[PDB]
Amino acid sequence: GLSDGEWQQVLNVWGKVEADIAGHGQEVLIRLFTGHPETLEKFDKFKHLKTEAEMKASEDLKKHGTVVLTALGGILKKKGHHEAELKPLAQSHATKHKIPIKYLEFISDAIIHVLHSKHPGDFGADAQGAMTKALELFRNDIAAKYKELGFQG
Ligand code: HEM
């Protein structure tokens, strides 16, 4: 996947993320649910949100949003030595949450969108680089385990 240099850039940028996980976790999820309204239907818990406003005005989402960048954070610090921590993840989104690989494709772009909005001007090309190749690795390894289980949908 990536080289040390790129792993550097990845955990450096994770730097920005750790300084405010609930605010970053919140804007990503709000990035997803408004950009792609159908992802919202997957959370019985949030299907009740109708506006952007009502979304920001929600502590539960802020909460959920911290569970996620905390679980990702975990896997990203492994530097691709995540089967351990990803295996458990692959089966729940596959079998119980039932989330399509494209929905994992969307949120990935939303990470990168989100970081440019919040850090416009110090999220450069090399960084953008290595963060994308790490979200791809993550995304491809899930694919791999989603294949294993026939989650064709
Ligand atoms: C991008 C990386 C993601 C990470 C790190 C992640 C992390 C997690 C974790 C740790 C849980 C709780 C434990 C479990 O149930 O496995 C969870 C729950 C869940 N995730 Fe994800 N998730 C990610 C992407 C997604 C996406 C893209 C969607 C939907 C488009 C999604 C939908 C859900 C749902 C529906 C649940 C359970 C709902 C609830 O809390 O009642 N996840 N996620």
PDB file of all heavy atoms in Angstrom, residues 32 39 42-43 45 64 67-68 71-72 89 92-93 96-97 99 103-104 107 138, ligand 1:
ATOM      1  N   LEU A  32     -22.047  13.555   4.677  1.00  0.00           N
ATOM      2  CA  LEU A  32     -22.692  12.363   4.121  1.00  0.00           C
ATOM      3  C   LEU A  32     -24.213  12.504   4.031  1.00  0.00           C
ATOM      4  O   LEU A  32     -24.723  12.618   2.888  1.00  0.00           O
ATOM      5  CB  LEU A  32     -22.223  11.169   4.956  1.00  0.00           C
ATOM      6  CG  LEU A  32     -22.424   9.749   4.382  1.00  0.00           C
ATOM      7  CD1 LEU A  32     -21.480   9.446   3.215  1.00  0.00           C
ATOM      8  CD2 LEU A  32     -22.187   8.776   5.520  1.00  0.00           C
ATOM      9  N   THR A  39     -28.151   7.697   2.659  1.00  0.00           N
ATOM     10  CA  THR A  39     -27.302   7.080   3.742  1.00  0.00           C
ATOM     11  C   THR A  39     -28.029   7.308   5.068  1.00  0.00           C
ATOM     12  O   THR A  39     -27.954   6.361   5.897  1.00  0.00           O
ATOM     13  CB  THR A  39     -25.825   7.548   3.664  1.00  0.00           C
ATOM     14  OG1 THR A  39     -25.883   9.007   3.687  1.00  0.00           O
ATOM     15  CG2 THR A  39     -25.082   6.995   2.416  1.00  0.00           C
ATOM     16  N   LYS A  42     -30.250   4.575   6.745  1.00  0.00           N
ATOM     17  CA  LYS A  42     -29.628   3.418   7.414  1.00  0.00           C
ATOM     18  C   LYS A  42     -29.529   3.548   8.930  1.00  0.00           C
ATOM     19  O   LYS A  42     -29.243   2.505   9.592  1.00  0.00           O
ATOM     20  CB  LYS A  42     -28.224   3.149   6.873  1.00  0.00           C
ATOM     21  CG  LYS A  42     -28.176   2.625   5.430  1.00  0.00           C
ATOM     22  CD  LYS A  42     -28.645   1.196   5.233  1.00  0.00           C
ATOM     23  CE  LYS A  42     -28.522   0.729   3.789  1.00  0.00           C
ATOM     24  NZ  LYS A  42     -28.834  -0.743   3.672  1.00  0.00           N
ATOM     25  N   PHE A  43     -29.725   4.776   9.459  1.00  0.00           N
ATOM     26  CA  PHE A  43     -29.640   4.974  10.930  1.00  0.00           C
ATOM     27  C   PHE A  43     -31.040   5.266  11.466  1.00  0.00           C
ATOM     28  O   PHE A  43     -31.481   6.428  11.430  1.00  0.00           O
ATOM     29  CB  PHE A  43     -28.615   6.049  11.281  1.00  0.00           C
ATOM     30  CG  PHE A  43     -27.185   5.960  10.848  1.00  0.00           C
ATOM     31  CD1 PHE A  43     -26.810   6.311   9.543  1.00  0.00           C
ATOM     32  CD2 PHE A  43     -26.194   5.541  11.748  1.00  0.00           C
ATOM     33  CE1 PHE A  43     -25.452   6.300   9.159  1.00  0.00           C
ATOM     34  CE2 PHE A  43     -24.862   5.475  11.386  1.00  0.00           C
ATOM     35  CZ  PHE A  43     -24.460   5.881  10.094  1.00  0.00           C
ATOM     36  N   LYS A  45     -32.036   5.750  14.182  1.00  0.00           N
ATOM     37  CA  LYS A  45     -31.546   6.649  15.159  1.00  0.00           C
ATOM     38  C   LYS A  45     -31.492   8.080  14.649  1.00  0.00           C
ATOM     39  O   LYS A  45     -31.629   9.020  15.424  1.00  0.00           O
ATOM     40  CB  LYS A  45     -30.107   6.199  15.509  1.00  0.00           C
ATOM     41  CG  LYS A  45     -29.473   6.667  16.785  1.00  0.00           C
ATOM     42  CD  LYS A  45     -27.961   6.465  16.792  1.00  0.00           C
ATOM     43  CE  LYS A  45     -27.482   5.846  18.099  1.00  0.00           C
ATOM     44  NZ  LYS A  45     -26.117   5.304  17.909  1.00  0.00           N
ATOM     45  N   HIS A  64     -21.945   9.822  17.950  1.00  0.00           N
ATOM     46  CA  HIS A  64     -21.769   8.734  16.938  1.00  0.00           C
ATOM     47  C   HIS A  64     -20.493   8.988  16.149  1.00  0.00           C
ATOM     48  O   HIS A  64     -19.641   8.086  15.995  1.00  0.00           O
ATOM     49  CB  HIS A  64     -22.993   8.526  15.996  1.00  0.00           C
ATOM     50  CG  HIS A  64     -22.766   7.237  15.221  1.00  0.00           C
ATOM     51  ND1 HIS A  64     -22.751   5.983  15.776  1.00  0.00           N
ATOM     52  CD2 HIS A  64     -22.304   7.094  13.950  1.00  0.00           C
ATOM     53  CE1 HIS A  64     -22.423   5.131  14.878  1.00  0.00           C
ATOM     54  NE2 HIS A  64     -22.197   5.748  13.759  1.00  0.00           N
ATOM     55  N   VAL A  67     -17.354   7.977  17.729  1.00  0.00           N
ATOM     56  CA  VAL A  67     -17.207   6.493  17.753  1.00  0.00           C
ATOM     57  C   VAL A  67     -16.465   6.122  16.466  1.00  0.00           C
ATOM     58  O   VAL A  67     -15.475   5.331  16.396  1.00  0.00           O
ATOM     59  CB  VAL A  67     -18.615   5.920  18.000  1.00  0.00           C
ATOM     60  CG1 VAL A  67     -18.914   4.530  17.472  1.00  0.00           C
ATOM     61  CG2 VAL A  67     -19.046   5.831  19.472  1.00  0.00           C
ATOM     62  N   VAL A  68     -16.914   6.750  15.379  1.00  0.00           N
ATOM     63  CA  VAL A  68     -16.377   6.502  14.022  1.00  0.00           C
ATOM     64  C   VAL A  68     -14.963   7.015  13.830  1.00  0.00           C
ATOM     65  O   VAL A  68     -14.208   6.120  13.333  1.00  0.00           O
ATOM     66  CB  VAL A  68     -17.326   7.034  12.911  1.00  0.00           C
ATOM     67  CG1 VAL A  68     -16.821   6.843  11.468  1.00  0.00           C
ATOM     68  CG2 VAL A  68     -18.706   6.434  12.988  1.00  0.00           C
ATOM     69  N   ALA A  71     -12.687   4.915  15.760  1.00  0.00           N
ATOM     70  CA  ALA A  71     -12.498   3.488  15.235  1.00  0.00           C
ATOM     71  C   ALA A  71     -11.567   3.615  14.007  1.00  0.00           C
ATOM     72  O   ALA A  71     -10.549   2.899  13.962  1.00  0.00           O
ATOM     73  CB  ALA A  71     -13.817   2.816  15.043  1.00  0.00           C
ATOM     74  N   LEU A  72     -11.804   4.558  13.121  1.00  0.00           N
ATOM     75  CA  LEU A  72     -10.888   4.759  11.994  1.00  0.00           C
ATOM     76  C   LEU A  72      -9.463   5.068  12.459  1.00  0.00           C
ATOM     77  O   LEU A  72      -8.427   4.527  11.994  1.00  0.00           O
ATOM     78  CB  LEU A  72     -11.395   5.884  11.072  1.00  0.00           C
ATOM     79  CG  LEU A  72     -10.579   5.949   9.745  1.00  0.00           C
ATOM     80  CD1 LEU A  72     -11.191   4.957   8.715  1.00  0.00           C
ATOM     81  CD2 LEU A  72     -10.545   7.307   9.163  1.00  0.00           C
ATOM     82  N   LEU A  89     -15.290  -5.064  12.031  1.00  0.00           N
ATOM     83  CA  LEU A  89     -15.981  -3.966  11.362  1.00  0.00           C
ATOM     84  C   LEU A  89     -16.643  -4.380  10.049  1.00  0.00           C
ATOM     85  O   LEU A  89     -17.795  -4.023   9.674  1.00  0.00           O
ATOM     86  CB  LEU A  89     -14.942  -2.873  11.159  1.00  0.00           C
ATOM     87  CG  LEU A  89     -14.685  -1.744  12.085  1.00  0.00           C
ATOM     88  CD1 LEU A  89     -14.100  -0.592  11.234  1.00  0.00           C
ATOM     89  CD2 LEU A  89     -15.958  -1.236  12.798  1.00  0.00           C
ATOM     90  N   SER A  92     -19.910  -6.458  10.712  1.00  0.00           N
ATOM     91  CA  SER A  92     -21.113  -5.752  11.171  1.00  0.00           C
ATOM     92  C   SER A  92     -21.725  -4.868  10.118  1.00  0.00           C
ATOM     93  O   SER A  92     -22.954  -4.759   9.948  1.00  0.00           O
ATOM     94  CB  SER A  92     -20.872  -4.858  12.434  1.00  0.00           C
ATOM     95  OG  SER A  92     -19.801  -4.001  12.185  1.00  0.00           O
ATOM     96  N   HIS A  93     -20.859  -4.142   9.401  1.00  0.00           N
ATOM     97  CA  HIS A  93     -21.501  -3.256   8.359  1.00  0.00           C
ATOM     98  C   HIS A  93     -22.074  -4.126   7.262  1.00  0.00           C
ATOM     99  O   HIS A  93     -23.078  -3.865   6.561  1.00  0.00           O
ATOM    100  CB  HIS A  93     -20.514  -2.146   7.892  1.00  0.00           C
ATOM    101  CG  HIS A  93     -20.391  -1.108   8.974  1.00  0.00           C
ATOM    102  ND1 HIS A  93     -19.818  -1.380  10.180  1.00  0.00           N
ATOM    103  CD2 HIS A  93     -20.780   0.175   9.030  1.00  0.00           C
ATOM    104  CE1 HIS A  93     -19.862  -0.290  10.951  1.00  0.00           C
ATOM    105  NE2 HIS A  93     -20.449   0.710  10.283  1.00  0.00           N
ATOM    106  N   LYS A  96     -25.045  -6.920   9.520  1.00  0.00           N
ATOM    107  CA  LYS A  96     -26.190  -6.396  10.333  1.00  0.00           C
ATOM    108  C   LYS A  96     -26.587  -5.004   9.934  1.00  0.00           C
ATOM    109  O   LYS A  96     -27.804  -4.802   9.988  1.00  0.00           O
ATOM    110  CB  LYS A  96     -25.939  -6.434  11.823  1.00  0.00           C
ATOM    111  CG  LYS A  96     -24.693  -5.829  12.455  1.00  0.00           C
ATOM    112  CD  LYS A  96     -24.857  -5.981  13.974  1.00  0.00           C
ATOM    113  CE  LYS A  96     -25.430  -4.705  14.608  1.00  0.00           C
ATOM    114  NZ  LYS A  96     -26.897  -4.585  14.434  1.00  0.00           N
ATOM    115  N   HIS A  97     -25.608  -4.177   9.655  1.00  0.00           N
ATOM    116  CA  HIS A  97     -25.930  -2.790   9.278  1.00  0.00           C
ATOM    117  C   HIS A  97     -26.327  -2.763   7.791  1.00  0.00           C
ATOM    118  O   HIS A  97     -27.153  -1.933   7.406  1.00  0.00           O
ATOM    119  CB  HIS A  97     -24.829  -1.723   9.557  1.00  0.00           C
ATOM    120  CG  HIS A  97     -24.250  -1.780  10.937  1.00  0.00           C
ATOM    121  ND1 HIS A  97     -24.976  -1.877  12.112  1.00  0.00           N
ATOM    122  CD2 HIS A  97     -22.933  -1.765  11.308  1.00  0.00           C
ATOM    123  CE1 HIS A  97     -24.155  -1.947  13.122  1.00  0.00           C
ATOM    124  NE2 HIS A  97     -22.918  -1.879  12.661  1.00  0.00           N
ATOM    125  N   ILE A  99     -24.286  -2.290   4.813  1.00  0.00           N
ATOM    126  CA  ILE A  99     -23.927  -1.039   4.122  1.00  0.00           C
ATOM    127  C   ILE A  99     -23.098  -1.294   2.871  1.00  0.00           C
ATOM    128  O   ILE A  99     -21.996  -1.838   3.007  1.00  0.00           O
ATOM    129  CB  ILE A  99     -23.172  -0.025   5.095  1.00  0.00           C
ATOM    130  CG1 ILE A  99     -23.865   0.192   6.436  1.00  0.00           C
ATOM    131  CG2 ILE A  99     -22.887   1.324   4.327  1.00  0.00           C
ATOM    132  CD1 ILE A  99     -25.178   0.968   6.591  1.00  0.00           C
ATOM    133  N   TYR A 103     -21.184   3.402  -0.188  1.00  0.00           N
ATOM    134  CA  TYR A 103     -21.546   4.209   0.983  1.00  0.00           C
ATOM    135  C   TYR A 103     -20.277   4.451   1.821  1.00  0.00           C
ATOM    136  O   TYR A 103     -20.175   5.423   2.621  1.00  0.00           O
ATOM    137  CB  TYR A 103     -22.666   3.551   1.755  1.00  0.00           C
ATOM    138  CG  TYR A 103     -24.085   3.665   1.252  1.00  0.00           C
ATOM    139  CD1 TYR A 103     -24.448   4.062  -0.033  1.00  0.00           C
ATOM    140  CD2 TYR A 103     -25.148   3.326   2.111  1.00  0.00           C
ATOM    141  CE1 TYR A 103     -25.756   4.190  -0.463  1.00  0.00           C
ATOM    142  CE2 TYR A 103     -26.479   3.414   1.700  1.00  0.00           C
ATOM    143  CZ  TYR A 103     -26.777   3.867   0.411  1.00  0.00           C
ATOM    144  OH  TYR A 103     -28.056   4.004  -0.060  1.00  0.00           O
ATOM    145  N   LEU A 104     -19.325   3.581   1.607  1.00  0.00           N
ATOM    146  CA  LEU A 104     -18.000   3.594   2.221  1.00  0.00           C
ATOM    147  C   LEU A 104     -17.078   4.411   1.312  1.00  0.00           C
ATOM    148  O   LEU A 104     -16.049   4.977   1.724  1.00  0.00           O
ATOM    149  CB  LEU A 104     -17.564   2.155   2.506  1.00  0.00           C
ATOM    150  CG  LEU A 104     -17.986   1.592   3.860  1.00  0.00           C
ATOM    151  CD1 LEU A 104     -17.835   0.081   3.902  1.00  0.00           C
ATOM    152  CD2 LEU A 104     -17.116   2.194   4.971  1.00  0.00           C
ATOM    153  N   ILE A 107     -18.331   8.475   2.135  1.00  0.00           N
ATOM    154  CA  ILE A 107     -17.812   8.966   3.407  1.00  0.00           C
ATOM    155  C   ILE A 107     -16.313   9.251   3.403  1.00  0.00           C
ATOM    156  O   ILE A 107     -15.778   9.928   4.259  1.00  0.00           O
ATOM    157  CB  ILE A 107     -18.187   7.944   4.559  1.00  0.00           C
ATOM    158  CG1 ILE A 107     -18.187   8.706   5.892  1.00  0.00           C
ATOM    159  CG2 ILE A 107     -17.264   6.676   4.489  1.00  0.00           C
ATOM    160  CD1 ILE A 107     -18.579   7.937   7.193  1.00  0.00           C
ATOM    161  N   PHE A 138      -8.081   1.022   3.198  1.00  0.00           N
ATOM    162  CA  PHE A 138      -9.127   0.677   4.154  1.00  0.00           C
ATOM    163  C   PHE A 138     -10.317   0.081   3.368  1.00  0.00           C
ATOM    164  O   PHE A 138     -10.718  -1.039   3.693  1.00  0.00           O
ATOM    165  CB  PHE A 138      -9.527   1.845   5.014  1.00  0.00           C
ATOM    166  CG  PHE A 138     -10.752   1.736   5.874  1.00  0.00           C
ATOM    167  CD1 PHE A 138     -10.743   1.025   7.059  1.00  0.00           C
ATOM    168  CD2 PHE A 138     -11.914   2.378   5.470  1.00  0.00           C
ATOM    169  CE1 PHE A 138     -11.897   0.962   7.843  1.00  0.00           C
ATOM    170  CE2 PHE A 138     -13.106   2.278   6.174  1.00  0.00           C
ATOM    171  CZ  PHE A 138     -13.066   1.588   7.378  1.00  0.00           C
TER     172      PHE A 138
HETATM  173  C1  HEM B   1     -15.827   5.134   7.103  1.00  0.00           C
HETATM  174  C2  HEM B   1     -15.587   4.204   8.217  1.00  0.00           C
HETATM  175  C3  HEM B   1     -16.557   3.746   9.292  1.00  0.00           C
HETATM  176  C4  HEM B   1     -16.207   3.388  10.539  1.00  0.00           C
HETATM  177  C5  HEM B   1     -14.810   3.448  11.213  1.00  0.00           C
HETATM  178  C6  HEM B   1     -17.427   3.023  11.239  1.00  0.00           C
HETATM  179  C7  HEM B   1     -17.459   2.725  12.577  1.00  0.00           C
HETATM  180  C8  HEM B   1     -18.563   2.215  13.198  1.00  0.00           C
HETATM  181  C9  HEM B   1     -18.552   1.610  14.508  1.00  0.00           C
HETATM  182  C10 HEM B   1     -17.318   1.412  15.413  1.00  0.00           C
HETATM  183  C11 HEM B   1     -19.817   1.264  14.768  1.00  0.00           C
HETATM  184  C12 HEM B   1     -20.378   0.540  16.020  1.00  0.00           C
HETATM  185  C13 HEM B   1     -19.894  -0.942  16.151  1.00  0.00           C
HETATM  186  C14 HEM B   1     -20.516  -1.851  15.099  1.00  0.00           C
HETATM  187  O1  HEM B   1     -21.775  -1.835  15.078  1.00  0.00           O
HETATM  188  O2  HEM B   1     -19.735  -2.400  14.290  1.00  0.00           O
HETATM  189  C15 HEM B   1     -20.637   1.683  13.657  1.00  0.00           C
HETATM  190  C16 HEM B   1     -22.007   1.533  13.590  1.00  0.00           C
HETATM  191  C17 HEM B   1     -22.773   1.813  12.460  1.00  0.00           C
HETATM  192  N1  HEM B   1     -22.304   2.351  11.291  1.00  0.00           N
HETATM  193 FE1  HEM B   1     -20.428   2.694  10.822  1.00  0.00          FE
HETATM  194  N2  HEM B   1     -18.500   3.143  10.377  1.00  0.00           N
HETATM  195  C18 HEM B   1     -17.981   3.570   9.174  1.00  0.00           C
HETATM  196  C19 HEM B   1     -18.701   3.776   8.008  1.00  0.00           C
HETATM  197  C20 HEM B   1     -20.078   3.670   7.957  1.00  0.00           C
HETATM  198  C21 HEM B   1     -20.895   4.133   6.836  1.00  0.00           C
HETATM  199  C22 HEM B   1     -20.271   4.750   5.551  1.00  0.00           C
HETATM  200  C23 HEM B   1     -22.171   3.946   7.159  1.00  0.00           C
HETATM  201  C24 HEM B   1     -23.482   4.219   6.395  1.00  0.00           C
HETATM  202  C25 HEM B   1     -23.472   4.873   5.063  1.00  0.00           C
HETATM  203  C26 HEM B   1     -22.218   3.380   8.494  1.00  0.00           C
HETATM  204  C27 HEM B   1     -23.327   2.983   9.182  1.00  0.00           C
HETATM  205  C28 HEM B   1     -23.399   2.483  10.463  1.00  0.00           C
HETATM  206  C29 HEM B   1     -24.580   2.000  11.152  1.00  0.00           C
HETATM  207  C30 HEM B   1     -25.999   2.066  10.579  1.00  0.00           C
HETATM  208  C31 HEM B   1     -24.207   1.609  12.358  1.00  0.00           C
HETATM  209  C32 HEM B   1     -25.056   1.175  13.581  1.00  0.00           C
HETATM  210  C33 HEM B   1     -26.162   2.207  13.906  1.00  0.00           C
HETATM  211  C34 HEM B   1     -26.348   2.549  15.350  1.00  0.00           C
HETATM  212  O3  HEM B   1     -25.380   3.063  15.989  1.00  0.00           O
HETATM  213  O4  HEM B   1     -27.503   2.254  15.808  1.00  0.00           O
HETATM  214  N3  HEM B   1     -20.899   3.235   8.956  1.00  0.00           N
HETATM  215  N4  HEM B   1     -19.853   2.257  12.699  1.00  0.00           N
END
